[model samples]
Target: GGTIARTIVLQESIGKGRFGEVWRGKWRGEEVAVKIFSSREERSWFREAEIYQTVMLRHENILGFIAADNKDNGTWTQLWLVSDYHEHGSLFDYLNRYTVTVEGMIKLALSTASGLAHLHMEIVGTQGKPAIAHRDLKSKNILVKKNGTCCIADLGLAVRHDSATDTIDIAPNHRVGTKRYMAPEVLDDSINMKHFESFKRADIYAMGLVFWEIARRCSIGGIHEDYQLPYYDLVPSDPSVEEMRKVVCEQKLRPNIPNRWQSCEALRVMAKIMRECWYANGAARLTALRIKKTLSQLSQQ
Candidate 1:
């Protein structure tokens, strides 16, 4: 109802990203995660606040937003965005520490696609919600829960499309996504900037790269490879767009899907989806909803 500043008692810093540092806080004895935005990143904080407060935005696969406010202690002020805390951390770190079984991989992959499906699907009528494109889709932006599922986070860079008026609400910022996960079009600067559907396909391309990471850590017959970043073998630790474009577009290369994945139904389905997602043509790429449906069917088989 009111501002949450007075209630937030920060326990410790949980993680840090380009946006800012996130802290684990205690609110009325319940734990929550509070993002303390850096001074220069207020625009994104404002944009994220706008996106999160939209009607019909709540979903299980999406990180639950609790409250957002600006704290003023009479001397300094800092922007805050609060949400439920998950101790298991980001999917990137989770995979680095452990591998998953066939069922476990299905749970993680399906939940991720489910989250993206809901993000891209627009809601009509009374509690209307616009379609959202996660401009910066990567493994670090998703958190793994203790229950073997995952949730999408960091809506700061998301672009919203309202069908009723046929307009897109894009933030006025030049900030780009991680170089490693940039789609072929984005890397080549040939993406359709005015078309909303183009962004959806780009998101699917990024999601496919994330799925590659999850699939690599998947255990088949009690065997799995050590965790590695999406293009560790092809690029440097912090690659530039030029370096990425050289490999991704000029060479038209993608992550390798090991032959062992074909033996497991869940991984087989995932690898197939990843292949579809990595298409050089965005129009030829699979939709998030399509992947959700395929994963749903695979889970039943």
Candidate 2:
């Protein structure tokens, strides 16, 4: 009701985003990630909090939400969202530092797919959860847990679909997602914004790109490529929406899947999944559940 009842001491700044800075804090002798929003980003804070509070949103592969509050320290209002802290940090940062083995790669990929599948599926029980689409899925938005698996984070751009009402609740935010991972439909502005499935498909397209980023750093028989952002060579550091549209929609280009990947069975399967995800037709893209099933089988082999 008032400011956070518990005392949380900020330790150090971990990262920064458009909305505000994220700090590694301590609450009740446990480490927590505290996202402190700027006064101007009150809506962003509220929207993320709303999504986090959804019923049954908690999952092993989704970041654990603790609490949200607005604090006024005599000078200004600070919106804070407290979550579980992952020492390994984001997948983007982890891949930059270390190459993963086949088992590690499969763990990361499967966990990510599992999280997305859960987010996309709707539960129809009395205490059910609406289908959620992570409109901004990327490596940077994923955290690598200490167990070598990944957890999906940053739901400020997420949209929820209520099947009963046939309605979608999308947060009013001026910011779009990372341009590098934007789907063809999204790049060209041809996405069916009204249809919930459209958002899910867009997330699949970005998921493929994130998979590519992780795959590139997978070591097979001591061979692995250096970590590089998706389409590192195609566009500028900060490409405009128009630039991305020409490259993605008009040219129909995708991140190149190396032929060497076919040499390894696990990499081969991942390559195939990525291909299905990059389909120009949003409907043709593989569903998150399908990808999770495929990876689950691969992990068992």
Candidate 3:
């Protein structure tokens, strides 16, 4: 009962984002990642903890949540979220360090798609989990596991659908997602915020970009490209909303797909799937389940 109240020895500072700094910690002699949020960002911390506590939220491709608590010792109160620690770190960091082979890329893509499909799906029955839309889906928000697969993380901006009331619980926060991965609808502010499916489709659009990021670093026929952000060539280091809108919405431009990808069967299939996901119309984008099924078949090949 008091286990959740026990102190976690922070071993090392691992990463940081807008909410707070993440640290490598030890709890009961086991490794854990601790995300300590600032007082001003209390709402962000609480919103994420609430999403993580959803019924039947546990999944292999989803980051495993351990505990959420607030600690104060006569000083500033610290909001903490503890989860499973992965040594390999985020997909963005991992890809920068090494390139993946055909099998490796497929495994990563399949596992990621599997995670998203699970998040976007709502299982029936009393213990069912609500359909969740990860408002921010990007390489930096995904983690690489020791087994060569990937897990989806950072659900701070996630929205859940309440089937009973046909309502959406959108967290009341001013924070927007990474501008570089924003979909055309999102950038242009034309997205149907009332329709829950609009959020899900936007996630698929970002997923396509993430898949492109992974596929770019995949080695095929002894050829591989260096790791580069999705719009490295099109946008500046820190792109503005207006800048992205012009390129993505006004110009209808997407990340470049290399001609060399057509030579490889796996790459060819991935290219086709990504194109479907990047459609200008949000409704025309492929569903997460369809992407999972397509990747499932490709994984067997």
Candidate 4:
């Protein structure tokens, strides 16, 4: 009964991000995800660590931490926080490889809501509490397990509230999320807590985008390859707040629910949820609790 600190050998690059490239690593005779900083010199290593420190080991959906390493190598490593190595692939890849039925999508949505709900809890040991917001929820960040359950990954941009404040602030110029999945209010510069009823509301917007992504692949037969998610082109060269607002709000381009999808009740309900999630007014968006309830009802059908 001894703790083993195995050296992680970089196997290959799985994905890259503004923070770093995720690598498949082997340690102690097991596989783990090692997100290595592109440059240990970069500020993101500490920035990400700070975010993790604030909200790690709390939510069921968030990635579990194994360890943080600042080795001599140029890359610093953030180890797996969880034990389920057999289930460490992105939901995006899973959906792309296999068509998600209504049951599958509902399961994924409920799992995601459950995760978000944990973050949103405001009061400790109470039913009502300030909510946690996943400022960057997206399909790619959603990890799927073998059981068809999904977990939200990447807390790189998550925001939470404790006894310190009643509300969490959204960064105006600090746009840092998957474009297609961003809420209109997030894209707009007119962000204040009043713009949203609650933290869960922002999650609802992102969840709507996720719903759109899932429906596109499973119900609508895959997102158009040419059709990029919202605001993807405007990175490193960020868009003007007005430009972002126009596209997300005034321009109003939404994922079109396929006519073919109309035939399936489960598919249609999912589509409806997506629509409500992306309502132009943040006040109109469905609550994550309600969304969880709706998806649950759908599954029972």
List CA RMSD, all candidates. 1.6, 1.6, 1.5, 4.8
lDDT of 2 at 89: 94
In order, the Cα lDDT scores of the candidates are 0.87, 0.90, 0.89, 0.64
lDDT of 4 by residue, 90-200 (tens): 877776677666667778878887776666555555344445577778777889877888877777666656555554544423555755555676676444653334445
Q: Lowest-lDDT window of 10 residues in candidate 2?
A: 166-175
Higher-lDDT candidate of 2 and 4? 2
Q: List, residue by residue over 1-301, the lDDT tens digit for candidate 3.
A: 2455256888999978768899999988889999999799998899899999999999999999998988775688888999999999999999999999989989999999999999999998889899999989999999999999999999888999987786798732322798999889888888877677888999999999999999999897679888999889889989998889889898889999998899899899889989999998999999989999999999997
Q: Can you rank all candidates by lDDT, best first? A: 2, 3, 1, 4
lDDT of 1 by residue, 151-177 (tens): 999888888887767677873233278
The estimated TM-scores of all candidates read: 0.96, 0.96, 0.96, 0.78
User: Candidate 3: how large is its RMSD?
Assistant: 1.5
For model 2, what is the error of residue 131's alpha carbon versus the real structure, in angstroms, after optimal superposition?
0.2
Overall local distance difference test of candidate 2: 0.90
